[PDB]
Design an enzyme around this catalytic site. Structure first.
Site, PDB file in Angstrom:
ATOM      1  CB  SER A  63      -4.933  -1.344   4.339  1.00 16.63           C
ATOM      2  OG  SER A  63      -3.562  -1.732   4.216  1.00 16.63           O
TER       3      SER A  63
ATOM      4  CB  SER B 122      -2.288   2.163   0.575  1.00 16.00           C
ATOM      5  OG  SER B 122      -2.061   2.111   1.964  1.00 16.00           O
ATOM      6  CD  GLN B 123      -1.477  -5.018   2.621  1.00 15.88           C
ATOM      7  OE1 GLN B 123      -1.293  -6.247   2.495  1.00 15.88           O
ATOM      8  NE2 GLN B 123      -2.270  -4.533   3.574  1.00 15.88           N
TER       9      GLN B 123
ATOM     10  CG  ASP C  93       0.898   9.318   2.238  1.00 15.39           C
ATOM     11  OD1 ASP C  93       0.881   8.695   3.303  1.00 15.39           O
ATOM     12  OD2 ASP C  93       0.484   8.824   1.194  1.00 15.39           O
TER      13      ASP C  93
ATOM     14  CG  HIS D 247      -2.179   6.960   3.026  1.00 17.75           C
ATOM     15  ND1 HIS D 247      -1.226   6.593   2.178  1.00 17.75           N
ATOM     16  CD2 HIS D 247      -2.868   5.809   3.347  1.00 17.75           C
ATOM     17  CE1 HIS D 247      -1.309   5.297   1.979  1.00 17.75           C
ATOM     18  NE2 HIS D 247      -2.296   4.845   2.689  1.00 17.75           N
TER      19      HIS D 247
END
Length: 197
Positions: free
Chosen positions: A26, A104-105, A159, A172
């Site tokens: 993101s 992540s995303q 995370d 993260h």
């Protein structure tokens, strides 16, 4: 560096043997973000510049933070974009071995795309690396319909997105060492296990 479109730009008549499709996290820039360039230079060292095409997921994937909250952890427009790049790879270079990754995303995007992929194309993805996988607990460390031995998840202790939350805490943001060493190592091993083109 942060934008690579080697598959879209590449000549069909001189297909690379390995095609890597990567989705960024993101709010990250270009289509490779912070981790993709490190993986890419190491793949290029192992397969040579003309041996591997690196392709980030750009286009409709805008990596908007709020889409983490959508059912699949990303937007359906972004899944359609990554599904279209796997399809382009399969059409433009049918004998190339594919490898994939996401952060992540972008890890939820890579998981969602591979789940929906036509089985004959999914089966050409020799290895997939996921960093800070936001659906790690929900999917129990797997990508649906894809073998565990071809998957490697990097989820740091602390995370929170790996443990069912969407809070962004400092672990993260700490996958830099992984993208420089073990994640390219895993992808290179899995391509050499089956071979190239």
């Amino acid at each position: 560096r942060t934008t690579r479109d080697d598959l879209i730009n590449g000549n069909s008549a001189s297909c690379a043997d390995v095609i890597f499709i990567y989705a960024r996290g993101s709010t990250e820039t270009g289509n490779l973000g912070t981790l993709g360039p490190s993986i890419a230079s190491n793949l290029e060292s192992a397969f040579g510049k003309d041996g591997v095409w690196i392709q980030g997921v750009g286009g409709a994937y805008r990596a908007t933070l709020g889409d983490n909250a959508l059912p699949r952890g990303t937007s359906c427009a972004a899944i359609r974009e990554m599904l279209g790049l796997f399809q382009q790879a399969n059409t433009k270079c049918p004998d190339a071995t594919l490898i994939a990754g996401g952060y992540s995303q972008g890890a939820a995007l890579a998981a969602a795309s591979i789940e929906d992929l036509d089985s004959a194309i999914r089966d050409k993805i020799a290895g997939t690396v996921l960093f800070g996988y936001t659906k790690n607990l929900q999917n129990r460390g797997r990508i649906p319909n894809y073998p565990a031995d071809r998957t490697k998840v990097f989820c740091n202790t602390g995370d929170l997105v790996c443990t069912g939350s969407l809070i962004v805490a400092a672990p993260h943001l700490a996958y830099g060492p992984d993208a420089r060493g073990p994640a390219p190592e895993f992808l290179i091993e899995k391509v050499r296990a089956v071979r190239g083109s």
